[PDB]
């Protein structure tokens, strides 16, 4: 994991994104979405990640 002033960016594309293996996973300390609701992410489609 890089540091805060040289953070690393990975672009995600060309795949189904299952946040179901992430949202029903109780292993993170903060999961804060802005502009979306973390329970409706499997009904949308996105251009990039």
């Amino acid at each position: 994991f890089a540091s805060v002033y040289a953070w690393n960016r990975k672009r995600i594309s060309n795949c189904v994104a299952d946040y179901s293996v992430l949202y029903n996973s109780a292993s993170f300390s903060t999961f804060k979405c802005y502009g979306v609701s973390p329970t409706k992410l499997n009904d949308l489609c996105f251009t990039n990640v």
């Binding site: 502009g35 979306v36 409706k40």
Partner: protein, 45 residues
Amino acid sequence: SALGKLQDVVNQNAQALNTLVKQLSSNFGAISSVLNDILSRLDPP
């Protein structure tokens, strides 16, 4: 083979209906202008 006093009424009314139609695409300070894109990616609260 003149009628501008009648064409003025037609034009003013069409010009008002066009503005009413076109105001349906302003956000008024929301995230989207279309209601279904607020309903689809947001929850009731």
